[PDB]
Symmetry: D2
Subunit: 249 residues, 4 copies
C-alpha cells in the first residue's frame, strides 16, 4: 500500500502545497482544515480525481482547550480509518496575529496562538507516536524567531516552543524509528490582509532574489525531510528563507 500523511491546515497556501506535493510523491493524504471547508473538499476532489481514494478531509479547531487532546487524537484516528496507517505528520496549521504587551480576550489569544503553534503539534505528535518503515514528523517553524516582529510575543513564544518540541520529540522518538525535523520559512506567501507596499518592503529585504518563497519551495524541503534521502536526519531545522535571517537591521 501507499504510505499516508496528515497535513494540518492543508486547505490553502503552504499546507495545500505540502499536501499536493506529498500526493504527487505517492502518499495518501488527510487534509486537516478548520474554517476552509469549501477549499478543503475542493482539494480532496482534485487529488481523488488523479488517484481515487487517496484523500480525505478532517475538520478540527486546534485552539487550546480541555478537548484539544481528543481533537488531535481524532485527526490521527482519521488517517487510520481512511488508510489503515499513518506514516507522516506535517504540523503546518498556525494562528498569526499581533498580541501587544501594552477584539479577543487575552485568554483566547493565548489559546489560539499557543494551541495552534505548539500545543496541538505536541498532542498530534503524542497521538501519532502512540498509534505506531520511514515514519517522520515535520514541524513548520519560523526562520525569524530570534529577530521577531514587534508585538508578536505570543506567536513567537509558540514557534519557539515548536523548536523545543522538534528537539525533544526527535530525542524521545528516535528509538521508535520516528524522525522529527522542522522547516523554517522566512517570508513565503504573504498574508491576504496585507497591503502591496508592505509586501514589497519585505521582498526587498530578501538577499536571494528580493522575493518571497513560493509555497512549492517550502514544500520541497518538507518532501526532502520525509524522503529516504533524509534517513539519518532528526532534530534538524532547515531554514528556507533566501538569506533573510542573515540581514542586520
Amino acid at each position: 500500500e501507499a504510505p499516508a500523511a496528515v497535513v494540518t491546515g492543508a486547505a490553502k497556501r503552504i499546507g495545500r502545497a505540502i499536501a499536493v506535493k506529498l500526493h504527487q510523491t505517492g502518499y495518501r493524504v488527510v487534509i486537516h482544515y478548520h474554517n476552509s471547508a469549501e477549499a478543503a473538499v475542493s482539494l480532496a476532489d482534485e487529488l481523488n480525481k488523479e488517484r481515487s481514494n487517496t484523500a480525505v478531509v478532517c475538520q478540527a479547531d486546534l485552539t487550546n482547550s480541555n478537548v484539544l487532546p481528543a481533537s488531535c487524537e481524532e485527526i490521527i484516528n482519521s488517517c487510520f480509518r481512511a488508510f489503515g496507517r499513518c506514516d507522516v505528520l506535517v504540523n503546518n496549521a498556525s494562528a498569526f496575529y499581533p498580541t501587544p504587551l501594552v477584539g479577543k480576550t487575552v485568554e483566547t489569544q493565548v489559546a489560539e496562538l499557543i494551541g495552534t503553534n505548539a500545543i496541538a503539534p505536541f498532542l498530534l505528535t503524542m497521538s501519532f507516536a502512540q498509534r505506531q518503515s520511514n515514519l517522520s514528523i515535520v514541524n513548520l517553524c519560523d526562520a525569524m524567531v530570534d529577530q521577531p516582529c514587534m508585538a508578536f510575543s505570543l506567536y513567537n513564544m509558540g514557534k519557539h516552543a515548536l523548536v523545543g518540541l522538534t528537539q525533544s520529540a526527535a530525542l524521545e522518538l528516535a528509538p521508535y524509528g520516528i524522525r522529527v525535523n522542522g522547516v523554517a520559512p522566512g517570508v513565503s506567501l504573504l498574508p491576504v490582509a496585507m497591503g502591496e507596499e508592505e509586501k514589497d518592503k519585505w521582498r526587498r529585504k530578501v538577499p536571494l532574489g528580493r522575493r518571497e518563497a513560493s509555497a512549492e519551495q517550502i514544500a520541497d524541503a518538507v518532501i526532502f525531510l520525509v524522503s529516504g534521502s533524509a534517513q539519518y536526519i532528526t532534530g534538524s531545522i532547515i531554514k528556507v528563507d533566501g538569506g533573510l535571517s542573515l540581514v542586520h537591521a
Copy 2:
C-alpha cells in the same frame, strides 16, 4: 524611595535566594508562592526584621486557565498596593516533571508546565509594563540545557523555549519604555532534597567547573547583575550560569 521587586515562586530554593539578595541590595520585595505558605511567611518575617515594611507575600496558582490573567494582574497590583511602585519582575516559579510522548491528565500537564514556565511570565510581563506610571527590568529563569533536553520532558522543554522567545520578544517591544528584559539559565543548581545523593552525584560529575551544582546564591548573583546599574545596556540577553555543563557532549 527604595525600589520594589516581585519574585515568583520565592518561598524556597532559588527564588528565595533571589528575594534575599534583592532585599540585601535595598529592594522591597513581593514574595509570591503557591503551596509553600509557611516558608513564604517565614521569609517575609525575616526580611521585615532586617528592615520594617519591606516584604509582603502574595499567593497564586500560575497554572494556565481562564483566571490566570486576573491572577497575574493581582500579583503585580500587590506590589503597587504595598510599595507604590514595581521596578523589577523575576519570573522564577516553574513546574518540572516528565510528560512522556508514549497521575495528571495531559491537559493538566499542559496547563501546569506551559502556564508556569511561559504563559504566566507573559501575563506578568504584560501587567508589569501596563502598570508603569528608573532602572526597570524583568529577569526570566531559563534553562541552559534546553537544546540538550532530558528524555521525556517535552512540555517542560517547550515551556522553557517559549520563555526564551518571550525574553527576546518583550525585550524588543519594551525597550522604548526603558524596560530591559533578560534571562538567567542555570544548568544544574539545587537538586531536589529527596533525590538520592548517588543520583545527585551523577549530575555533579558532569559539570566541568568543580564537578558540583550551582548554589542558589550563585544563580541569584547573575539576577542581581542584570537588574543592576552595571547592566543598563543589556536587554534580550540570557546568561548561562552552568559551570560549562551545556558544553559537554554525550
Copy 3:
C-alpha cells in the same frame, strides 16, 4: 551541456561519496586530492567508464601558505578548463587532530585553520570571481557547540566555516550563488581510532545507535545543490541522527 562540480578531498570517504552521487545525478566532476593520487585516479576511472570524459583529478595542498591563493584559483580553473563552467563547489577537505592548550603550533594553525576555513574562503572567492543553479556546500560539524576535549584549533576552524557560510551566503546572494552547510555528527570514524572507542560513539546516537554512512552525508549535499533547494542559502543542515541533542 551538463553542469560541473568541484569536490575537495574527493578521493576517499565522505568526499568520494559526494563526488559519486554528484556524478550519478549527472554532474561532471573535479576530484581534488592532496596525498591520495592513486585513489583519486581510481575514482575518476570508475566515473569515466560510466560516462566518457566526465571526471578529472586535481592536486593541491590546502594547508595555509603564501601559495594557498594560487592553489585555490587553480582548483577552480581546472573545472573551467575541463568543462567550461563550474556550477557547484563542495568544501569537503579537512584536517582533524587534537591541539591541547596545556608539528609546530603554526603548522597546526595552517593545517587546521588553513584547510578547514581559509581554503574554503579562497575557493569561494575564486568560484564567485569566475562567474543557472550555482551553489556552494561547506562540510561543517554538528558538534561545534559541544566540542571534543583538547580540539580548540579544530573547533575554531569549524566555527570560522559557519561564519564563512553565513557571510558568503549574504554577499553572494546578489549573484544568485547559494551558500549552505552540511554538518555530520559521527560518520565514518577515523581509520586510526580504536574499535572500542568507535562503539562508544555509536552507542550515543539516538537514531539507530550507529554512524552515518558517507552516502547519507552526500544525500544532504545533493539536496542543497538541487532545484529543490533554490530558495535555501545560509542554512546548515545537521545530519547527526540526533547526536547533538544528547546531554552529558
Copy 4:
C-alpha cells in the same frame, strides 16, 4: 597582594575602559598596544599616578606569523615579570576592515591580520596564560552581530566566530584548572574614529534600548562582572551587551 590582568589593545577605546575599570577594582594591569605607543604610556602614567607600580605597557603585533606564539608568550611573561602573577587575560585587540569576496593588502596579509588578531592570538595567549599558571579567568571580546554580519566582512566574521569556538573549547578544557573562559559581545559601541556623524546616527537609530551606542564603560561593566566573584560558576557564557540590536529584523 593585588591580582594582575593583561588587556590586549588597551591604549584606547574599549580596551582602555576595561584596563581602567580593572585598575579601579584593585588590579595591576599590563597595557598591551601595537601602534598606539603615546596613548598606552599616557594611560600607564595616569594609573601609576593613582597607585605606583600598578601599570606597565607591552608592545606586540598580533598579526598571525611564525613568531606570533613567541609574542604571545612574551605578553604573558611581561605580566609575571612586572607583577609576579597573571590572574586575568582580556582578549580585546582586533583588526576590522572589509574583505570583499568579489573584487592595499594582499589577501594573505588580510588573513594574517583579521584571523590573527581576532582568533589566533587569543588562542596562543590562552595557551600561554594557562601554561604559566584565587579567581583566574579569560574574557574574550566577541561580536553580538556575528550571525547578521556586515556585507563584505567575511574574514572579520570568520575570526569572531572562531573566537566563540575558542571561548567554548577553552572553557571546557580549562575548567579542571579553575580557569573560567567567557565572552562579552558588543553590538554597536564606540563607533570608529573615522566614521562620519551621519553614518554613526544610522547605526544609533537601529538600537531598541535608547537609540544609542554602548559606552565603553558599559562594555567594561560586563567584563568586570565576568571576572568578579559574582560570576564564579559562569564559564563558557557570552554575554551580549547590545541594547537589543541583534533582535531587530531587517
